[PDB]
Amino acid sequence: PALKYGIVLDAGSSHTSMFVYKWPADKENDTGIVGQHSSCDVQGGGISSYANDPSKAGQSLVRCLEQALRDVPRDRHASTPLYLGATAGMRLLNLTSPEATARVLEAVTQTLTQYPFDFRGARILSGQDEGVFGWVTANYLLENFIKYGWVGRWIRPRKGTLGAMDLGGASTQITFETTSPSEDPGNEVHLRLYGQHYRVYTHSFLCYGRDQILLRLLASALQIHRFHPCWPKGYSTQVLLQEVYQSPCTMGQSAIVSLSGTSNATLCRDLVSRLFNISSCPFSQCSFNGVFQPPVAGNFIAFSAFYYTVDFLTTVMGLPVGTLKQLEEATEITCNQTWTELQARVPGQKTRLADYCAVAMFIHQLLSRGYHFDERSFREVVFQKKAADTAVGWALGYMLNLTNLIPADLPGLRKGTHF
Ligand SMILES: Nc1nc2c(ncn2[C@@H]2O[C@H](COP(=O)(O)OP(=O)(O)NP(=O)(O)O)[C@@H](O)[C@H]2O)c(=O)[nH]1
Ligand SMILES: [Mg+2]
């Protein structure tokens, strides 16, 4: 059939990626119909890394945009919407300097507006937006919003949805369908998709993203130990304190200090447990830091750094992660490697290598102590980054919303036969 296109730039804290989506022009309202056509990863940091040089943020996008000009056929350029949405890197810069933030949005805007696409704006997503649009992505791709059954015999309970857990660079999101009463309006989400109501919980923990957790652990390690128990014995580095303390995430804790690893799983576990304040709950029950959260229920997909970390544990370390107990053993085993041990298991590039013990430990604690998974509910979590050929993230659901492609109700209401 005739095909339509749309483009999303996911301007995250640590990277920008460009996704081109495509769909049939006359069957564009079907769930699962939109899928990924192509993508491009911008080189270097995310747009917020250019706060002191905002025109470089715009120019960073140029190669991917040239690829978009080749990927979308010329005759459709002018009618292809293009959107940029930015996450916790831009949220954190907006705490630091609303002016620098606005100059970075202005530079990316000026670059984008001179391409021939229907450029529809650069915006900073709220934490709720980022969590919910990821849940829409996952569930749309896997066709969970289809009403299964036939007239006189609908499946009951209605088809379950898949919960979403996103471990980004600067924040982490959890979002799931719940039957529990809502006790905090900032967590409450009601969706009308294809004639049905989904009652959803969402929360974004700013500063609980992977790179921000590593910075807090580094600060905390320097304060309490003057060595890093999560780092492998024999690894060390020259740490620039200004970088540690400038983040809004750490500055609540002279120029260069040497820091070495000790391969101490038990002390690493204790350093990480300080990240989670479970000391009080103004609600009937909480995740952590006083945040309302109903009991986790149903299947979940854990993507982005959940996936990258688990893939290292399984593929590189050779260790199972099928139960929380296995995940915990995998983490101890990893944390107890010397730097020479660890490097010997990775023959290719070592960037990130010293950090897997800390991130795995954070992940095990986040799921068990923070979100209150147990062995029974954890069984229903899968680690994946792709569904039906499309990368899992908030970009697709953002696109679907802004291009108005998921209807609140089916046309003519399917003659009321779903009532
Ligand atoms: N181990 C590993 N980490 C990766 C890989 N690719 C990206 N990362 C890291 O994993 C974390 C998550 O990446 P990503 O989801 O792209 O983050 P983001 O969208 O830029 N951040 P945010 O959503 O918080 O604004 C970051 O700290 C990033 O650097 C990979 O292949 N392996
Ligand atoms: Mg992200």
UniProtKB/TrEMBL annotation:
Binding site for ATP: G169, A170, S171, T172, Q173
Keyword presence, Disulfide bond: yes
Keywords: ATP-binding, Calcium, Disulfide bond, Glycoprotein, Hydrolase, Magnesium, Membrane, Nucleotide-binding, Signal, Transmembrane, Transmembrane helix
Pfam families xrefs: GDA1_CD39
Chief place where the protein resides: membrane
Record-given protein name: Ectonucleoside triphosphate diphosphohydrolase 2
GO molecular function: ADP phosphatase activity; ATP binding; ATP hydrolysis activity
One of the record's GO cellular component terms: membrane
Record's bilayer topology term: Multi-pass membrane protein
Organism: Rattus norvegicus
Localization in the cell: Membrane
Co-factor requirement: Mg(2+); Ca(2+)
Family: Belongs to the GDA1/CD39 NTPase family.
Gene Ontology annotations of biological process type: cellular response to interferon-alpha; cellular response to lipopolysaccharide; cellular response to tumor necrosis factor; response to auditory stimulus
Active site: E130
InterPro entries: GDA1_CD39_NTPase
